[PDB]
Structure 1
Amino acid sequence: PLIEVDLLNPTAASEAKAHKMKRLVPTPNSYF
């Protein structure tokens, strides 16, 4: 986006909204 944000460290709220493969470290959304 035009409004640049810090991406080396992401916010905890913004990580949970991104696609599971588009995070800084892709992690599954499944439990158990």
Structure 2
Amino acid sequence: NPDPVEESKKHKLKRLIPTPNSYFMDVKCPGCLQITTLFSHAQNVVLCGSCNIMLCQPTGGKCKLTEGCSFRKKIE
């Protein structure tokens, strides 16, 4: 009955209603501790602000961050 099926979330991008599986993330760097806006699925290198040390390594999936760091979802 495809009007309002709740557990359809698992289907491919292009469902009953479009919805991105991509979001923005509030991230901070271990030992430097400044807030940064960042994109889950970022496509080019991502630096920490005070001294440019890499944060996230881009690669063609969801992107792999670094071993460190802590991440809130930045959805309102």
State TM-score, norm by structure 1: 0.53
Tell me how many residue pairs correspond in the alignment: 24
1:27 maps to 2:19? yes
Listed as ranges, the matches of 1:1-32 within 5 Å are 6-11=1-6, 14-21=7-14, 23-32=15-24
RMSD: 1.1
List 4+ stretches of structure 1 deviating above 4 A. Answer: none
Any gaps of 5 or more consecutive residues in structure 2?
A: 25-76
The letter of the residue matching 1:7 is P
Q: Which has the higher strand share?
A: 2
| Identity across the alignment (%) | 42
Give the secondary structure class of the aligned counterpart of 1:9.
coil
